[PDB]
Amino acid sequence: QRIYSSIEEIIQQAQASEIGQKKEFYVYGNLVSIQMKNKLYYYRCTCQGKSVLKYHGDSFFCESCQQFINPQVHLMLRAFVQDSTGTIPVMIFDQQSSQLINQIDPSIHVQEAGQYVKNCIENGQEEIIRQLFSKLDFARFIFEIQFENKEFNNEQEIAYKVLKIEKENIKEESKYLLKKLEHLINN
Amino acid sequence: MKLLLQNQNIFQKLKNTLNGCIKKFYDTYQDLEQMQKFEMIVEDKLLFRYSCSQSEMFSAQIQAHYLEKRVLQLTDGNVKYIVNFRDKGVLDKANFFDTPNNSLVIIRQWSYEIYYTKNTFQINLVIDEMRCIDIITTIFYCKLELDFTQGIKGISKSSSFSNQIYEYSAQYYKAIQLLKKLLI
Amino acid sequence: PQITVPLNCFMINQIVKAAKENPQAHSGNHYEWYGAFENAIITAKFEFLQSINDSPKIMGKLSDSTGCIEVVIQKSKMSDELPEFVQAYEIELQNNGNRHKYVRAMLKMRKNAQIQLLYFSIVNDANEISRHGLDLCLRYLQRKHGIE
Amino acid sequence: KQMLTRKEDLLTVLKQISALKYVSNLYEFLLATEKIVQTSELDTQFQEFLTTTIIASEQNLVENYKQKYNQPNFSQLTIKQVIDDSIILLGNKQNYVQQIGTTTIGFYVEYENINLSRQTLYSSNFRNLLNIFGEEDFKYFLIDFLVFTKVEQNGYLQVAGVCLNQYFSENQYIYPEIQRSQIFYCNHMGREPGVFKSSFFNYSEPQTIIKKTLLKEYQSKNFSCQEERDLFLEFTEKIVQNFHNINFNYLLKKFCKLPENYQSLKSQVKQIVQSENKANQQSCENLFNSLYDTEISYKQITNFLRQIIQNCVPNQLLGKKNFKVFLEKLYEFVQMKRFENQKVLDYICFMDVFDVEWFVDLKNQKFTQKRKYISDKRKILGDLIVFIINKIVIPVLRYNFYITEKHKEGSQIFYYRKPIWKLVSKLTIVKLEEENLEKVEEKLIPEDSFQKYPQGKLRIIPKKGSFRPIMTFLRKDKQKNIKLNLNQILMDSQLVFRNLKDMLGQKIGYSVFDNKQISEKFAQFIEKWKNKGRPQLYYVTLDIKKCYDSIDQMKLLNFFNQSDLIQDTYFINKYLLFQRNKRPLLQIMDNINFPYYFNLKERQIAYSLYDDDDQILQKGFKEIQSDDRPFIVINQDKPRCITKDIIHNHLKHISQYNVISFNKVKFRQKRGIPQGLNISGVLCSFYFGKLEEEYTQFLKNAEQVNGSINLLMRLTDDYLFISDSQQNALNLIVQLQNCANNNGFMFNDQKITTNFQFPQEDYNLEHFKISVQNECQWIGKSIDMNTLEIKSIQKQTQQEINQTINVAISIKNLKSQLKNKLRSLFLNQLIDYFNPNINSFEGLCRQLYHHSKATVMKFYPFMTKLFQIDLKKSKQYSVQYGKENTNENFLKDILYYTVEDVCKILCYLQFEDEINSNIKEIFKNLYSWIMWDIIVSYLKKKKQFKGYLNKLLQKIRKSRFFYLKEGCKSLQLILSQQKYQLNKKELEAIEFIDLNNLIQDIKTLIPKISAK
DNA sequence: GGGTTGGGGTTGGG
């Protein structure tokens, strides 16, 4: 079976953790406040092209495969997860972002989400994207969160990334709360 | 934001001001009259007051404050400090935007305060002028800290985890030893 | 140390009554129940209340097994429409033959002011009631033990 | 007509923008909304704030904010709470002033960055504003309006609303680009002439290898079918086979061969290198000149390239006529300037698609869609051209030649054979080693600085009898985790020293940095000279030789440490500045926006934590304005901190452990600071200012000791001194010589230019070479000793002028590019010395005459290049200018509008707003006539312009003359009405016009203005 | 699994 921890426990363990340490947790929480100020997506090749050579006129050519490739869009999103206890900023990758996009709008296909977002942004239809992001506010889920104590530009930092996102169901969450409260009463 | 405060190098200013205070006290009390040394050795009263110079101003974020004991907590990046302030007038002069808490402030001037208590000497840091600039509602989790309201016990705590804290604690202990050697 | 805490109508009532009866507290809008808070979470049925000559403010009602609270709903000023979360409740109410339902509501309260309700979601599962009750008790225990 | 004004109002400017429908100040808005009444009383400061505050909105929303009797206005929440509510209501929108430095999380807002503008938002004035307004109306007013508050005489700070920068923002094929820049500065040399061993020409020694090495062209998307790719592969195989049969030695010996005395030069270089004692200076200079006189000619190199191409590339690859066209254009490409480049269209527009025979079409579009077929084949022809050039021509020039520019030849290009450059490099290394560079070993330099700082590269430019080293610091070390170069590392200290430069101007020496400072100093000295009564003047000119290398590192460090003008800690603020341009306000076709009237600039600033007078903490900017026109500033949320200790460490590192590389050989400076660093100029100015203030004590008291007017400026290492006392000048020379002797530096060439003659024996100045001239020349400026007037120095020949002009033309933005280029050419230097406080009307006229005469010759190559393209083939220009004389109409329109704009700017600069409009118009007409007469006189002889255009230009000139005469005639009647009282400047202008007799003709003023 | 802000353009003094 699984064990669920709270946001405050995750925060304390991440702070106490040394540089280069990783750990995973499962949390009942709700997504909120998706950020779109930075670039929403990046380009990668099918053969896991580490370096993508930018050209003009929407021309692309990978280096890990060395063929004329059609660019592939990978969706990058930042938001905040929060339980009743605390709030933290999280990294959402292509798979999870596409999953939420298809969940909120079944019309767009799973890997079609990045292309749809890119097309809307380039054409100049940002109101639709903003409304779609707003419709995801206070969306309860079950989150698999991993923290990394890593150093960037000779500066220590802690980064939070979500690994799995699952549909929520009240029964086992209530059971977990019940056993936790019973344990507290017993102690 | 954390980098901006870490670049301040508060420890350098603290060490320089402590050295200046120690030297000034040493030169100003070279009389060494035994009865005078005896009579200024009394319980719970200040003996000297050294105001910091204009060069050593720094900025920190206020995390908590206590009006009853006039205790104010400052922090930046990894290190948080607990100091005292002169009175409520310092708070009123600082045109706080909403509240003292979670507000970024710049210390215009402060002064080291020396006290004799329980047959030893305690050095206090008192904030004199305060100025608020902008509100920072970002909680910094300081693993390390030093206390100016407990003396040597409140400073030498957690010294093993920070080289700068170790050096400052050594300087504090040397200053205490010199003060007690001169006065007694 | 947390601004959001879950509690029900009776807790709202006792807190408001105590604050009004004993106003010798800090000169700040924050309430005091084992600390200061501004946000609350409550699950109870919602029903519209017809006010008079009050266009900008829309009066609500949250009856629960412990009591009833009054909240105010604010709408946009540049144009006269309703927030999407309440239009959804209105259309659901007209669709289901005018049947009220429990909702999971998050609301902000400040002393010397009305209780503003910012967002709610209609709940269709009964286990959410037990979830809310257990969460309330657990959070109250946590706050009491963290005070000490 | 519309005139530029020195004084403008922000509200007046804003009312001229069509996008904004409602513009008013806060007080009148409140009165209209009835939130307050005139009978109500307020504090004077609050009333002034309400009056000065300016708000605007895209629509009229007065009714929406009308006072409502349903419920009164009492406030119980905090201003922070109201602002948080407004930010939450803003939601996902991410372009507003109030959101800067903060983020929204659900119904909670978080502040994490420093915003200096929040003080105005949370001030007591805004608190009282909220008290008047009410929460529900304030939360929406902060969004529906753009709020601007006055904080200076003319400056405004936006605190709410959409950020102003938001208003300053199906595909088509784009051809590849010729990589011409790769030719320059190649120091590599190889045993056998040819190309680099890494090239596919040498890598091959079948079609498999060629395909592997040329996939980038083989798998291009422009190819219709696999057969085309196979044919191209076969052509590449044939090219590769033909290439190996080229006798490069014979070609070099035939076309561009070494000089006959090459062996003698090599022997001389070897002897100089091996000689232990110092080499003879004149012998080394002669060797330098002899080496530099071995350059190859453009025609020779063109013949070389043509011979290489003809026997290497099959003629059927491009077509019989296209091959000849390419060969002909090759010369034009060869003679092409340094910062100039060709385009693929320059070849495509002149060759024929149908000439190619091996082209095959999958679908029979040759007769159905001829235009589509032509485009499809052009897409392949351009690819072939780019491949051929960038794979054969550029590598050959890079491998077999060193290509660069000389010292005083401007942008002109020169070629040198590789062995000659090897000899030059050896000789230059020998010269530098004895003086300032030493070979270094990585053992000595500490590993900390070794991994912390990147190294530099050295480049040498030929000079007459010598060289000119240039060291660059562009590279960054991929290893050791380095992502920035030295300038990017040090730009913080650069900001700090730029702040220092402000008080460096007048406090601790005589240092100048810009033409504005030079002009104001000149104006003050001219006024003092006028007060004295125009006595005789004498001048002395001298300069320091190699100022950067003569800087004592220990002395510089001591000055930095003991200087109190540098504070311990500084904070960095970033902000955006919006400033009025030089465009007059339109008077009320419908699409008028902010960029039409304002220019956006990004600025950074460093400020101290002291309670300074400028109180940067309150505003966030420090700008100097030469006019009363308003400007707008918005702050940013990216602050930085810098400490004096970091600057000290950087200075110590650059002074001691400066490491540069050359030919994979490391070197280290021994004295001075390296030129090319962003702080070098300021550091040099400060260092020499210390010594000059040390040795110029007498000048501090001389002007009241005996009342002698004297002026001293120093720009970097150049000195200029004008005084009234020959004794003062001699004393200054003696003191400067003493200071140089004491501090171990010297002056260039031992040469000094004076206005007098004195015995050098008395003052031990025998070694000096005094040159006596009656006209001073300083930093390229010409000064009169009689009228004390200043004008710039211009070249005299078209050959001299063309050497400094880079021509870049794109068909997309011809009008904009040409208009901006001509505007910049006219306003490059004239605006900085058109001060009426310096010159008289005749002086201004002469200055404009000479500057225009220079600029027309400067700009002539641009229309020569323009005529190479016929605009009748472009719809965008044909629909606007017909099809017969499109080029002539376009040029006429450009010239007319540019001249009109220049004349308007000149009148604005010359006169103030109080001067009469008739005088302004008359002077504008006179200037326009002068410019047009110069242009017509220059262009009346050219063959291309000989016909249609000259009549139009003559008509324009005649119209300008007629208008000037008519205005002059009408001005007399205008003034005769007694309705106007003339001031001293107006009387001077009237006297000038009457003296020159502008009523009849212009023949009187021409001899006075055209004198050289 | 991401990551200053990379350019565009080239005149006149030093």
Ligand SMILES: [Zn+2]
């Ligand atoms: Zn690939």
